[PDB]
């Protein structure tokens, strides 16, 4: 299981340092590949690095614009992207591959790092509880929501009751309006569980170290 660094907001023309680490094995027994995916776009290969000897290779597209290094001491792989442009805004993945071990190729992937290249500043979100209107209890099921408004950049994580409520949960993709993101999430539980029991939506915005817990209380 690979661990990648957190979301990054970088200024146009600046550079970024991305990390990919693991403690479940020696990164020396693998080849490290970096891959990126732009919004509503496909996959794009960037290059590979052999931690074992420092050998590397980049796609023509990223020649002399993407340094790849490794620190086998802490079992970590790095990818440096220089002179970043708005086009480089995407989700970067690291992929550790190996076939010299068993009769099957070992393939591991990181969770991805969201890199946004922009002139805008990070903006924490406002979290608003969405309680049903007076008319929404004479039913059997009840729907509640949380509105995560005006943040930048992506992404945000939303959970309900710290993960104890997952079935019935819907988290909608963020929409960009006036250079700020807005996202909403809904959860549907039995009318017998709420308001009798407390429902809370938890929001985290990595880019701004923002943590919010908002309890949904009836109107």
């Amino acid at each position: 299981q690979l661990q990648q660094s957190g979301a990054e907001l970088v200024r146009s023309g600046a550079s970024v340092k991305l990390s990919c680490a693991t403690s479940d094995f020696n990164i020396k027994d693998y080849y490290i590949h970096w891959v990126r995916q732009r919004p509503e776009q496909g996959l794009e290969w960037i290059g590979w690095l052999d931690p074992e000897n420092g050998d590397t290779e980049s796609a023509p597209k990223f020649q002399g614009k993407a340094t790849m290094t490794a620190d086998t001491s802490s079992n970590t792989a790095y990818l440096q992207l220089s002179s970043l442009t708005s086009e480089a805004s995407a989700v970067y993945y690291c992929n550790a591959i190996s076939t010299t071990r068993d009769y099957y190729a070992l393939d591991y992937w990181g969770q991805g790092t969201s890199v946004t290249v922009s002139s805008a500043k990070t903006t924490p979100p406002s979290v608003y509880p969405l309680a049903p209107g007076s008319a929404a209890q004479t039913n059997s099921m009840v729907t509640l929501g949380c509105l995560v408004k005006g943040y930048f950049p992506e992404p945000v994580t939303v959970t309900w009751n710290s993960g104890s409520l997952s079935s019935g949960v819907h988290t909608f993709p963020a929409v960009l309006q006036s250079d700020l993101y807005t996202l909403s999430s809904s959860v549907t539980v039995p009318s017998s569980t709420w308001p009798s029991e407390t429902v809370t939506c938890n929001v985290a915005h990595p880019a701004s170290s923002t943590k919010v817990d908002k309890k949904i209380v009836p109107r």
């Binding site: 496909g42 969405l130 209107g133």
Partner: protein
């Protein structure tokens, strides 16, 4: 530089049916003094990192259902899924690793299921957001199929087609339905200026518009 092209760009099939998607490269991926086809297939479920399914054109990765089969040689390749499961929903890509690495445009696999009417919920602005001068009205339209749906907002009878944010979730891995969020943002003043707010939806599942509304007056 080798170019990869895939077809179809997307297709929908119901659970249990067989599916075949192809991949084409502008140059042969079969190494002469080796007899190996340098091609691979990856699967990427929504929100997740891609996963290796097949390499060497036909070698299945360990832990990959026998449902997936890779065939082809030279410039023509195919990925086949014997009996599609609702969990197979994702985007499939082929990658050549003959000369550098390049990914095809991918094939999006959707799941066809029985039609389902949406469960609609409308939410007045939060007392907290109003205390900040903002007023967002939200409407959720959950668990519906097909994806095609029409939503319109009405305020005191007058429709509003400006200042509305809509977002669709990816098809659900479990029930194969779609959900959508529609947010109407106004200023507190404009909000306090009217009484009736309506979220109206049209879906092929009904010959009548599903309507939900509330009057600011009530508590």
């Amino acid at each position: 530089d080798i170019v990869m092209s895939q077809s179809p760009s997307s297709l929908a099939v119901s659970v249990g049916e067989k599916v075949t998607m192809s991949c084409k490269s502008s140059q042969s991926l079969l190494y002469s003094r080796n007899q190996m086809n340098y091609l691979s297939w990856y699967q990427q479920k929504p929100g997740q990192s891609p996963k290796l399914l097949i390499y060497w054109a036909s070698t299945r990765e360990s832990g990959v259902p026998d449902r997936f089969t890779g065939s082809g040689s030279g410039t023509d390749f195919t990925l086949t899924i014997s009996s599609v499961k609702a969990e197979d929903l994702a985007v499939y890509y082929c990658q050549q690793y003959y000369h550098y690495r390049t990914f095809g445009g991918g094939t999006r696999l959707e799941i066809r299921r029985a039609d389902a009417a949406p469960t609609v919920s409308i939410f007045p602005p939060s007392s907290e957001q109003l205390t900040s001068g903002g007023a967002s009205v939200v409407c959720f339209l959950n668990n519906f199929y097909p994806k095609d749906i029409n939503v319109k907002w009405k305020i005191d009878g007058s429709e509003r087609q400006n200042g509305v944010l809509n977002s669709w979730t990816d098809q659900d891995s479990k029930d194969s339905t779609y959900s959508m969020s529609s947010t109407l943002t106004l200023t507190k003043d404009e909000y306090e200026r009217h009484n009736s707010y309506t979220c109206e939806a049209t879906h092929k599942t009904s010959t009548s518009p599903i309507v939900k509304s509330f009057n600011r007056n009530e508590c």
